[PDB]
Amino acid sequence: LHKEPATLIKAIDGDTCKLMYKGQPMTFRLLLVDTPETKHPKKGVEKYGPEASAFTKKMVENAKKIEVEFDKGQRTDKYGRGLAYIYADGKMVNEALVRQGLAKVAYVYKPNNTHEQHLRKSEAQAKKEKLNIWS
């Protein structure tokens, strides 16, 4: 995979944000994970949703550098959101969230699953430690 620079425009929630990519604003959705919902009425504000948003927001807003890394399959979903692993100063937001128990490994669609095992080992550690979602 290859990392590419991006510029934070606006953090929306734990797993969705707007970034300037290739001189074009677009919303991105984190690959392989799912932070709780805070916008959709069908799900309501799920437990830990706000916590996940705050964690992500702090992480991306305080970064000197943001990079996006597409996987080997499709680069956008049906809603036109970019699908990537996002790094804030070299730290993967997707993993950071899972490690804290603020996200679950979800939507594993191949061939977009290069980092699946890494994220799963982190989720296991969070459950093991009974963190947030796993408390």
Q: Does 42 bind ligand THP (CB under 6 A)?
A: no
Q: Which is nearer to ligand THP, 64 or 72 (CB)?
A: 72
29 near ligand THP, judged by CB under 6 A = yes
Using DSSP bridges, classify how beta strands 82-88 and 24-30 pair: parallel, antiparallel or unpaired.
Answer: parallel
Distance (Å, rounded) from C-alpha 12 to C-alpha 85? 16
# binding residues, ligand THP (CB under 6 A): 10
Between CA 27 and CA 38 the distance in angstroms is 17
Closest approach of ligand THP to the CB of residue 128, in Å: 24
Cα–Cα distance, 92 to 77 (Å, whole number): 20
Q: d(Cα 93, Cα 68) in Å, to the nearest integer?
A: 10
Does position 104 interact with ligand THP (CB under 6 A)? The reply is no
Q: Which does 97 bind (CB under 5 to 8 A by kind): ligand THP, Ca ion, none?
A: none
| Active site members | 29, 37, 81
Rule CB under 6 A: say whether 97 interacts with ligand THP.
no
